Structure formats: C-alpha cells, structure tokens
Amino acid sequence: HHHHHHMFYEIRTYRLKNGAIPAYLKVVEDEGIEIQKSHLGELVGYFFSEIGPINEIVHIWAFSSLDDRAERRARLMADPRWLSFLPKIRDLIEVAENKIMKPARFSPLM
Amino acid sequence: IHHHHHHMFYEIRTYRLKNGAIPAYLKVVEDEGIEIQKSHLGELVGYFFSEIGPINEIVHIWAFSSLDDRAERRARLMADPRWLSFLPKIRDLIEVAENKIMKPARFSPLM
Amino acid sequence: IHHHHHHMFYEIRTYRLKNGAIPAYLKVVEDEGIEIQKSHLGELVGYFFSEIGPINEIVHIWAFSSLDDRAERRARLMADPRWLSFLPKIRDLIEVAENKIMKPARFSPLM
Amino acid sequence: HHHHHHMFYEIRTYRLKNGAIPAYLKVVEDEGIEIQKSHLGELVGYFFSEIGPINEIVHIWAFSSLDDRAERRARLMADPRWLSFLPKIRDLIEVAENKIMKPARFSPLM
Amino acid sequence: IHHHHHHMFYEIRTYRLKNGAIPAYLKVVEDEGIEIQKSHLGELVGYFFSEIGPINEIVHIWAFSSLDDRAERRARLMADPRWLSFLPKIRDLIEVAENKIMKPARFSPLM
Amino acid sequence: HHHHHHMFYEIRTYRLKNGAIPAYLKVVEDEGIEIQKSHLGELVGYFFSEIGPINEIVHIWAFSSLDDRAERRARLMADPRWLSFLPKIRDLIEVAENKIMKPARFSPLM
Amino acid sequence: IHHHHHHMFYEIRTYRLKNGAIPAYLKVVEDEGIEIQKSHLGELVGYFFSEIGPINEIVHIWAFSSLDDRAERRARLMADPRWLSFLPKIRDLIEVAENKIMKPARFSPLM
Amino acid sequence: HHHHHHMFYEIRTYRLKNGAIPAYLKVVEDEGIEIQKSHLGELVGYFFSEIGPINEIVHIWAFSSLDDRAERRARLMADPRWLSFLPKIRDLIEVAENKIMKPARFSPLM
Numbered sequence: 001h002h003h004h005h006h007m008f009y010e011i012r013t014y015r016l017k018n019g020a021i022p023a024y025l026k027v028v029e030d031e032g033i034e035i036q037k038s039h040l041g042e043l044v045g046y047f048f049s050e051i052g053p054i055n056e057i058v059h060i061w062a063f064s065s066l067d068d069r070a071e072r073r074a075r076l077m078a079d080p081r082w083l084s085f086l087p088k089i090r091d092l093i094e095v096a097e098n099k100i101m102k103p104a105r106f107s108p109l110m
Numbered sequence: 111i112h113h114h115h116h117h118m119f120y121e122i123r124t125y126r127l128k129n130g131a132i133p134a135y136l137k138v139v140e141d142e143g144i145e146i147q148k149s150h151l152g153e154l155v156g157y158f159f160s161e162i163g164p165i166n167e168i169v170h171i172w173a174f175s176s177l178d179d180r181a182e183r184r185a186r187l188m189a190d191p192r193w194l195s196f197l198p199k200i201r202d203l204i205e206v207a208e209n210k211i212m213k214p215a216r217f218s219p220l221m
Numbered sequence: 222i223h224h225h226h227h228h229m230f231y232e233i234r235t236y237r238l239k240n241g242a243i244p245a246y247l248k249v250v251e252d253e254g255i256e257i258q259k260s261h262l263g264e265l266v267g268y269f270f271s272e273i274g275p276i277n278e279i280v281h282i283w284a285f286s287s288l289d290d291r292a293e294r295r296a297r298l299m300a301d302p303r304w305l306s307f308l309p310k311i312r313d314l315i316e317v318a319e320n321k322i323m324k325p326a327r328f329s330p331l332m
Numbered sequence: 333h334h335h336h337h338h339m340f341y342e343i344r345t346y347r348l349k350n351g352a353i354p355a356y357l358k359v360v361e362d363e364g365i366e367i368q369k370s371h372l373g374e375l376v377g378y379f380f381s382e383i384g385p386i387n388e389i390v391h392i393w394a395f396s397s398l399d400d401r402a403e404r405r406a407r408l409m410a411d412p413r414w415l416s417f418l419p420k421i422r423d424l425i426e427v428a429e430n431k432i433m434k435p436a437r438f439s440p441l442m
Numbered sequence: 443i444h445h446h447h448h449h450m451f452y453e454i455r456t457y458r459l460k461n462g463a464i465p466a467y468l469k470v471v472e473d474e475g476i477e478i479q480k481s482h483l484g485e486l487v488g489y490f491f492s493e494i495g496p497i498n499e500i501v502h503i504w505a506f507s508s509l510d511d512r513a514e515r516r517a518r519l520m521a522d523p524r525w526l527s528f529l530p531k532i533r534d535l536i537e538v539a540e541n542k543i544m545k546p547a548r549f550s551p552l553m
Numbered sequence: 554h555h556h557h558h559h560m561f562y563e564i565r566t567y568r569l570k571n572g573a574i575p576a577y578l579k580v581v582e583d584e585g586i587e588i589q590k591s592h593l594g595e596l597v598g599y600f601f602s603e604i605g606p607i608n609e610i611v612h613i614w615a616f617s618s619l620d621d622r623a624e625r626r627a628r629l630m631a632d633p634r635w636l637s638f639l640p641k642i643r644d645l646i647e648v649a650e651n652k653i654m655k656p657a658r659f660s661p662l663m
Numbered sequence: 664i665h666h667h668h669h670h671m672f673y674e675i676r677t678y679r680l681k682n683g684a685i686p687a688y689l690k691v692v693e694d695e696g697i698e699i700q701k702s703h704l705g706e707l708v709g710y711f712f713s714e715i716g717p718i719n720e721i722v723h724i725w726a727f728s729s730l731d732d733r734a735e736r737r738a739r740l741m742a743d744p745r746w747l748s749f750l751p752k753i754r755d756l757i758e759v760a761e762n763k764i765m766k767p768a769r770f771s772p773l774m
Numbered sequence: 775h776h777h778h779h780h781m782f783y784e785i786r787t788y789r790l791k792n793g794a795i796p797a798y799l800k801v802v803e804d805e806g807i808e809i810q811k812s813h814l815g816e817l818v819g820y821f822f823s824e825i826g827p828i829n830e831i832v833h834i835w836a837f838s839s840l841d842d843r844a845e846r847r848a849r850l851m852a853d854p855r856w857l858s859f860l861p862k863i864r865d866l867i868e869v870a871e872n873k874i875m876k877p878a879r880f881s882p883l884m
Contacts, residue, residue, distance in 0.1 A: 001137065044219065047122075051431065166760060315462075319384075383652065488662035547599040666822075673821055689775040
C-alpha cells in the first residue's frame with residue numbers, strides 16, 4: 001500500500017510556552033532554519049496553530065531512509081552553530097513528540 | 111507578523127483506524143474515494159499512514175485559500191451522493207478523528 | 222469574589238460519537254428526544270456539533286439554579302419511561318462522554 | 333443538520349497556573365474583555381471551573397463566518413491596547429486549545 | 443517519613459464502561475459478583491459510579507496489608523471458576539480500565 | 554442503582570511538582586488539614602502515589618448534598634486561615650481535577 | 664555523546680487490548696505467532712502484560728542494529744502469508760497500539 | 775499465562791524538561807545509577823527517546839516480589855547518598871509514572 005521508491009516523512013509537533021509562537025518563529029527564521037536545512041536536506045512544511053491546539057508548532061521533513069535520517073541528525077547535533085542556536089528555543093518548547101509516517105500511493109508528497 | 115500576508119490555510123486531519131485496517135482503508139480510498147474527495151476539496155497536500163508513533167494512524171493535509179472557501183467546498187463534498195455512497199466503506203474503519211487549521215511559517219516551503 | 226453572588230451553574234456535556242454518526246444523532250434528538258429532555262432539565266443554553274477540532278463531537282450546555290435542583294431534575298429525567306425509551310436511539314451512537322460544572326465570570330453574558 | 337443561516341461558535345479552553353483563576357478573571361474584567369469584545373463582536377459566555385478540570389477557563393464567541401473571525405482577530409492582535417494587556421495573562425495560561433463548532437437546529441444559540 | 447510505618451496499601455481501580463451500561467453493570471455486580479469478589483480480595487473500601495466528571499465511570503477501592511498478599515488474593519480470585527463464570531457478565535460492559543496503588547497520608551482516616 | 558439516602562463523594566486528584574509529595578504532605582498535615590476538615594466535615598481518605606501516576610495526591614470528601622458542599626467550600630475559601638495556608642501548596646500543585654461520584658448500593662462507604 | 668557509538672535501537676510496542684483479552688491473546692501468540700514473528704524480526708528483548716497500571720496492556724520490545732534493517736525485517740514479516748494468516752487471531756483483540764524507538768543509555772545492560 | 779517462578783518488571787517513564795536528556799543521563803551515570811543499583815538489585819534496561827515522545831526516559835527494573843521491591847526502595851530512599859543525589863534530577867523530571875508488568879511465558883526476560 002505504498003510505492004516501492006518513496007520518502008519517509010518525519011512529523012515533529014511541539015507545544016510551546018504560552019504566547020511564544022512569534023518569538024520562536026523569529027529566532028528559527030533568523031538563525032536556526034538554514035542550519036537545520038543544511039544538514040537535514042528536505043524541509044517539507046513548517047506550521048503554527050490557528051484552530052486546534054494553541055501554541056503548537058508542526059514541522060515536517062522528508063528522508064530517503066531512516067539510517068540516512070540518523071546520519072544527518074547526528075551531523076546537525078555536532079554542528080557548533082546548531083549547539084549555539086539551541087538555547088534560543090530550548091525553553092520555548094515545553095513538550096515535544098515525533099513520528100515517522102509513509103506516503104500513500106496517491107499522496108502528492110511521495 | 112510571523113506569516114506572509116498572502117498564504118494558504120492548512121487543514122491537518124488525523125484518524126485512528128480500527129486495528130489492522132490501514133491496508134483495507136488505503137485500498138478503497140485509492141480505488142473509490144480520493145478522486146471524488148479531491149474534486150470537491152481541491153488541493154491535497156499530503157496523505158500519510160503511520161510507521162513509528164501512533165499505530166493505525168492516517169494523516170492527510172489539504173490547503174485552502176480561506177476558511178469560508180473551505181466551508182463551501184466541504185458542504186459540496188457532503189452533499190454529493192457519490193461521496194455519501196463512498197463513506198460507508200471507510201466510516202467504520204475510522205474509530206477516532208480530529209482536525210486542526212494551521213498557518214505556514216514564513217520559511218515553510220508549503221506557503 | 223470573582224463571580225456574582227446570584228448566578229446560574231453551567232453544565233457542559235461533551236460526547237464523542239461513533240465515527241460518522243453526527244447526522245443520525247442530531248436527527249433523532251431533534252425529532253424524538255430534545256423536547257422530553259428539556260421538559261425535565263429546564264434551561265438548555267446551547268447545543269453544538271463539531272466542525273474544526275475533535276471530530277464526531279457533541280457539546281451541550283444546561284443552566285441550573287443549584288446543583289441540588291440539577292440532581293432532582295436529572296432523577297426525574299432518568300425515571301421517565303418516555304426518556305428511557307428514547308435513550309436506545311442514541312446510547313450506541315455515543316462512545317465516550319464527560320460532564321463538568323462551571324460558574325460564570327462576572328462579565329459573562331450567560332449569568 | 334444545521335440551519336442555513338447560523339453562527340459559528342468558537343470554544344476556547346485554557347488551563348491556568350494553579351490558583352490563578354481569581355487573578356486572571358480580575359485582569360480580564362478590568363482591562364481585557366472590553367478590548368476583546370470591541371473587535372470580536374459577540375461574546376457568548378465566559379466560565380471558570382467548579383467540578384471537573386480545576387484551574388480551567390472556557391470562553392465562547394460567535395462569528396458570522398470564519399473569514400470574518402479571521403479579520404476581527406487580526407484587528408485585535410494589531411491593537412496596541414491588546415498587545416499591552418497580553419503580558420498580564422500570558423504567563424497565567426499554561427495550556428490552551430480552541431475549536432469551532434456549529435449549532436444544532438434546536439440550539440437556542442443559533 | 444510521610445506515612446505511618448504500619449499502614450494498608452490502597453488499590454484504586456477505574457473503569458470506563460460502554461455508554462449507558464452503569465445500571466446493568468451495577469445490577470449484575472450486586473446480584474452475582476461482589477460477594478465472590480470480596481471473598482477473595484478481602485477489604486472493599488468503596489465502590490462508586492460517576493455523577494459529575496467522566497461519564498460511564500466505575501471506581502472501586504480495596505485495602506491490602508501487603509502487595510504480595512494482594513497478589514496471592516488476586517491469583518485465587520482469577521482461579522475461581524465461580525468468578526470466571528461471572529466475568530462474562532461485565533467484561534464487555536467495561537471498555538477501558540486502569541489500576542494504581544497508593545499509600546495513606548498520616549492524616550488519612552483510611553489508614 | 555444507589556440507596557435513597559446516600560452521601561456524594563468528591564474525588565480530588567492533583568499532580569504535584571516532581572519530588573514535592575513529602576513537602577506537600579508535611580504542610581497539609583501541620584497547617585491545612587484541620588482547617589479544611591473544620592469546614593468540609595467528612596474527610597474520607599487522603600492518599601499519595603506508589604505505583605501508577607507518580608507525584609499524585611488523591612483525596613476524598615463526603616457531602617450530604619452538592620448545595621451543602623457549595624456552602625461549606627465557600628466558608629472554607631472565606632476563612633483567613635485557609636487563605637494564609639494556600640500559598641504553601643499553590644505552587645506545589647501543577648495540575649488538578651475533581652469529580653463527584655455516588656456510592657453503589659454495596660459500597661461500604663455509603 | 665550520551666550513548667555508546669555502537670549500540671542497538673530498541674522498539675517498544677504498546678497495545679491496549681479488548682477488556683479481558685490478555686489470556687486469549689497470550690495463548691494464541693505463544694502457540695501460533697511468536698516463533699513466526701521472531702523469525703523475521705530477530706531479537707525479542709522482552710514481552711510483558713500488565714499487572715499494576717494500565718489494565719489489558721501488552722508491551723513488547725525488540726532490538727535492531729539499524730532502522731533500515733528494522734524496515735527490511737518488518738517488510739518480510741508483513742509479506743509472509745504465515746504471519747498474515749496468524750494476524751486475524753489477534754488483530755481484533757488489540758484495540759489501540761503505538762510504537763516508539765529509543766536508544767540505550769551508556770549504563771543500560773541492554774546495549 | 776505466566777511461569778510459576780518469574781520476576782516482576784517495573785517500567786518507569788519520565789518526561790524531562792525540554793533539552794534535559796544529556797544532562798540527566800550524565801548525572802545519573804556519574805552519581806546516581808550505582809547507588810540505585812546497589813539497593814534495587816536488577817537493572818534491566820535504561821533508555822532515552824529517539825522517535826516517539828521527545829525528552830523521555832524509560833527505565834526497567836526486575837524484582838522477585840513486590841514486597842521485596844518495597845523493602846529495597848525504602849532502603850534506597852533512606853540512603854543519604856541517594857538523598858544527596860536527588861536534587862540533581864528532581865527539577866529535570868517534569869512528569870513521571872510507573873507500572874508493574876509480568877513476563878509472558880515466551881519472554882526472554884523472565
């Protein structure tokens with residue numbers, strides 16, 4: 001029920017400190033996202049709450065395999081630029097979770 | 111402001127299926143449902159099933175230019191007897207469901 | 222004190238229905254249940270079904286002058302064979318349910 | 333299963349810092365609610381916990397359409413008076429969520 | 443230490459029933475189950491059903507002198523064909539269940 | 554399915570700051586519980602975690618009716634001694650909820 | 664780094680069963696399923712059922728040298744008609760399920 | 775459906791302060807785990823998040839009986855070395871829970 005060649009989609013969901021969405025999005029835009037992209041490779045989407053959970057961030061990344069994901073994230077974590085960035089969001093995120101999902105055969109994101 | 115002035119709204123729909131129902135669900139959606147659903151709702155962004163995390167989960171994402179337009183589209187979907195005749199094939203496969211509306215960050219490739 | 226001395230108590234009842242059951246539920250409640258239910262419980266405040274958020278959700282709200290009066294009203298509701306004969310038509314449509322009692326803020330239009 | 337002409341009901345539910353209901357209700361009454369009403373238009377109800385979740389606020393607003401809701405909330409967020417008010421509740425709210433619901437045909441709130 | 447040295451352990455068992463099943467459940471437990479259950483488990487502390495909060499909920503509480511004794515008692519309960527023949531009458535009325543072990547505060551009347 | 558004359562049981566469940574059970578139980582024992590009992594009337598049980606949720610308090614009170622409960626709690630909240638006590642637990646409790654339950658006919662607590 | 668460079672990945676699978684289904688589930692898994700499952704997935708670490716906490720719960724844990732290897736193993740499991748013919752015997756006993764991947768601490772005996 | 779002679783497995787799950795896994799694992803390794811093992815007796819496994827809940831610790835201990843567990847934990851709690859250690863993780867853990875589980879007959883951990 002999925003195509004032979006397909007990407008894996010990681011969905012990361014964060015609940016932020018109440019009111020922190022603007023500050024979080026600013027520092028990620030200005031400093032974090034380009035570092036993150038440079039290691040992880042395919043940012044799919046990056047969203048914030050409007051109706052539903054409030055103070056929520058959802059971001060989605062595509063990976064050719066989970067071993068490749070692991071290698072890429074390890075390089076990200078070892079990057080001094082990322083380590084310098086992290087304190088700027090570490091206390092804005094309260095609770096976090098991730099999942100890996102696969103595309104249906106009819107998903108436009110394959 | 112922390113989003114672009116002109117942007118799409120993203121609806122994320124998350125279903126927990128009856129245990130073991132993913133293959134049956136995806137089959138009948140592919141063969142009998144998704145073209146009808148797209149023909150009303152418009153821009154399907156992505157359609158996923160779970161591998162690590164919640165098991166038996168479906169997530170699908172749609173983009174809309176406004177929530178009033180979303181509303182008009184869903185009304186047409188729900189009034190279409192071609193869709194109402196399809197729904198019985200998945201509505202017992204789905205146990206629990208939720209949706210949310212989110213906006214894209216300025217740096218989201220999905221704008 | 223952060224509420225008016227004389228005020229009503231608000232009961233908010235939230236149900237998660239069987240997936241896809243909202244239209245059937247609302248039909249039979251309208252046609253066969255709500256007048257009987259109101260005739261015991263009294264002041265219905267609002268009765269809603271979900272659009273964005275939890276799917277398959279019903280929320281209904283009732284106002285009472287006291288919780289002892291609420292109790293007496295619900296006892297009469299539950300003893301009425303006209304209501305007990307109605308309940309089978311929704312009790313399998315409802316999967317999960319909860320209620321809570323809340324008080325109005327001083328600036329609530331619902332006092 | 334709803335009337336052709338009807339309002340949309342937004343239900344906002346907040347879990348506050350333990351013990352914060354009195355302080356929250358005071359500052360909302362004294363400063364926030366009139367600003368909020370002036371932009372949003374139809375406050376329906378505004379409630380706090382008694383039996384159930386403790387430290388909870390539930391407030392309900394009616395809107396003629398979700399596009400109208402969006403316009404109104406944007407004006408609220410741009411109001412310097414609201415921006416000055418927000419710090420007074422931003423740290424009293426811990427967790428928050430909202431939903432949009434529609435009235436049944438037999439709802440007294442239509 | 444924040445409890446008395448000699449104290450009982452309290453097991454709190456919480457069930458969510460099938461919607462509307464409380465009256466049927468309580469009837470058959472009263473008539474056919476609770477005496478057998480007590481005869482193995484010992485000291486029933488309290489047995490409650492919900493009014494405001496979660497709906498369709500049962501909470502029952504048992505006291506034990508030790509958790510090894512609890513274990514031996516539950517093993518005997520589960521081995522008794524009189525109990526295994528009773529269980530079918532409630533096991534489909536119960537949807538979801540959990541238990542926890544708690545200790546009494548020094549100022550708890552239940553010691 | 555309950556006896557005509559019966560009490561109502563309020564079950565209050567608190568999740569505390571991690572590690573706070575000892576400190577919480579000490580100050581409640583030394584200062585709070587006697588004040589609380591004096592207004593509320595029938596403490597049934599007062600428990601803390603051992604296996605299950607960690608950092609949890611569960612306490613149970615019996616009331617002849619919910620209107621009587623309301624009157625008693627109002628007097629408790631107006632007692633300067635209780636108002637002086639509350640700051641000593643207000644920040645030890647993180648999340649809280651209550652429910653009202655009724656006794657089965659075969660409950661030893663009736 | 665807070666783990667050893669060479670380590671296994673641990674998958675923890677948690678199921679909530681139909682109330683009262685643990686004995687039936689464990690019987691048929693023992694007799695008809697676990698050897699087939701092990702023959703694809705490899706290193707079973709532990710397989711548990713609940714006593715205090717969530718009731719009707721199964722937790723099983725598997726170790727993998729890499730997530731790509733896990734993926735290849737699960738694909739082979741799901742393609743095996745011997746496993747697909749076994750699944751009907753548990754897939755209605757399981758109500759809700761989730762999995763997670765965790766790494767061992769440096770001081771974990773499971774490395 | 776379990777073997778006559780078998781161990782009980784305690785599974786302890788903690789959600790930490792966001793970003794705290796490295797610091798937590800360091801202080802547990804350097805100071806806490808040897809004290810803990812010395813009283814509790816059979817550490818089975820000790821894990822941290824990778825995909826699923828983020829900021830999560832799961833640790834598993836085996837006990838011959840729950841009375842033995844109780845005795846061992848009481849000695850741990852009375853150990854001045856453990857009492858000196860606890861402040862170093864008390865505020866890194868936000869939410870915690872434990873459960874006791876039994877091994878299936880075919881579990882390699884018996």
